[PDB]
């Protein structure tokens, strides 16, 4: 019949009741303080922060030294230690229940390029990343929601094909050296 | 009192299958006579030709004339009335056009103050009713 994949799942989740005023205001001031496009990509990372807390809280109703609690629980924690949301010396299955939504929005590319000083005015970081200026070590990436790890966190910089790291100016500086040199010397 | 002992699961399961025939939304979905009776025949929309405009009168607290038609279908053709759900849009429809009547909002019960209409008109003559109302589309030439 077909060698097609067939597999996909949704990433976000719609809220249970809508229009309640205390939610969509405190969930509004995430859309501007970390600079996002719409509430789907808050509902994205909320569902990410949900299922981790689902998995971790399932690991507390287990008895101690349970073989899959020791394996899968520790592999969980080093997965959110390598991404830089959980500081390493305090690794427990109980400190993860205190992790909130605000610490996943810090580990994006789009705001690890604001605080590193590569850009100002967080909405300007989308105007730099998506408009193809900013690389991770040898791979330029136009994605705001690129959750940058802690290892490759020192190596955010502009790129070599990029204007800010190389040359060959774009069509407006080339026009500005043309608008005086197109009808005269 | 009810049964409880480790042997009565035939009695309890047989007592449940015959007492579920006493709420409506199991009975109209599993007896079969309720879907051999609705004009849609278990579908969501239906085309049918317009026989006659009729103006029904709203409920007692209110006082107006709700604009309606007398559509007779093409799928196992049956006589129904349908509402024209807009301000001026009865004037778009004429004699023996074909219209796509839809459900009207609360599963075969009448909404609003129109006494006993069950259906509403969208898409007269294959052009949308909101498109006619907003000036997007028109009748053929």
């Amino acid at each position: 019949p077909v060698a097609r994949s067939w597999v996909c799942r949704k990433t976000y989740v719609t809220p249970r009741r809508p229009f309640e005023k205390s939610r969509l205001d405190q969930e509004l001031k995430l859309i501007g303080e970390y600079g996002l496009r719409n509430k789907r990509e808050v509902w994205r990372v909320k569902f990410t922060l949900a299922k981790i807390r689902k998995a971790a809280r399932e690991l507390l109703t287990l008895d101690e030294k349970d073989p899959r609690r020791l394996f899968e629980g520790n592999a969980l924690l080093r997965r959110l230690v390598r991404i830089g949301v959980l500081d390493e010396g305090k690794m427990k299955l109980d400190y993860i229940l205190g992790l909130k939504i605000e610490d996943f929005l810090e580990r994006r590319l789009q705001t690890q390029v604001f605080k590193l000083g590569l850009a100002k005015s967080i909405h300007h970081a989308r105007v730099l990343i998506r408009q193809r200026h900013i690389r991770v070590r040898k791979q330029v990436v136009n994605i705001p929601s690129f959750i940058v790890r802690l290892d490759s966190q020192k190596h955010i910089d502009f790129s070599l094909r990029s204007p800010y790291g190389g040359g060959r100016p774009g069509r407006v500086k080339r026009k500005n050296a043309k608008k005086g040199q197109g009808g005269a010397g | 009192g009810k049964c409880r002992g480790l042997r009565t699961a035939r009695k309890l399961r047989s007592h449940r299958r015959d007492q579920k025939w006493h709420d409506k939304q199991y009975k109209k979905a599993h007896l079969g006579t309720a879907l051999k009776a609705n004009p849609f025949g278990g579908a969501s929309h239906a085309k049918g030709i317009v026989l006659e405009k009729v103006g029904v009168e709203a409920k007692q607290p209110n006082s107006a004339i709700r604009k309606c038609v007398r559509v007779q279908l093409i799928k196992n053709g049956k006589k129904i009335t349908a509402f024209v759900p807009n301000d001026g849009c009865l004037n778009f429809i004429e004699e023996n056009d074909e219209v796509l009547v839809a459900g009207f909002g609360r599963k075969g019960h009448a909404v609003g103050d129109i006494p006993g209409v069950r259906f509403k008109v969208v898409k007269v003559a294959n052009v949308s009713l909101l498109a006619l109302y907003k000036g997007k589309k028109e009748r053929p030439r």
């Binding site: 690389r135 040898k138 791979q139 330029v140 990436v141 790129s159 070599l160 094909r161 | -």
Partner: protein, 131 residues
């Protein structure tokens, strides 16, 4: 030429097929994706034959420029390059002629021969004059 560097990796030779097969990655900072025939002469100066037994294909530029990567292979001889080679990559640099009819004709030709038995004088001229 100037800054187009030919790294390769996962080298493997075999006397099953008399080829040398390896994974090629080409690192080019500020150019377009380099041609196949621009590179297959650069393997002629790495494994020291002539650019006739080097077939390079499957080049896939990564996002943002820089490292495109492909697969390439080198036979031991040209008479080995004709035997155990698929006929299309042998035609990358013209060495095989596959210009036939479309397959819609060849089926109808086969179904028109099918209605004629035995008469070899008409089993071949089965509607070949009407052109």
């Amino acid at each position: 030429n100037d800054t187009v560097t030919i790294r390769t990796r996962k080298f493997m030779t075999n006397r099953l097929l008399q080829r040398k097969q390896m994974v090629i990655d080409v690192l080019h900072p500020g150019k377009a994706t380099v041609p196949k025939t621009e590179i297959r002469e650069k393997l002629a100066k790495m494994y020291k034959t002539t650019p006739d037994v080097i077939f390079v294909f499957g080049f896939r530029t990564h996002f943002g420029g820089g490292k495109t990567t492909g697969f390439g292979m080198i036979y031991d001889s040209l008479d080995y390059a004709k035997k155990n080679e698929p006929k299309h990559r042998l035609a990358r640099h013209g060495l095989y002629e596959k210009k036939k009819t479309s397959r819609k004709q060849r089926k109808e030709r086969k179904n028109r021969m099918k209605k004629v038995r035995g008469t070899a004088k008409a089993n071949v001229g089965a509607g070949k004059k009407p052109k």
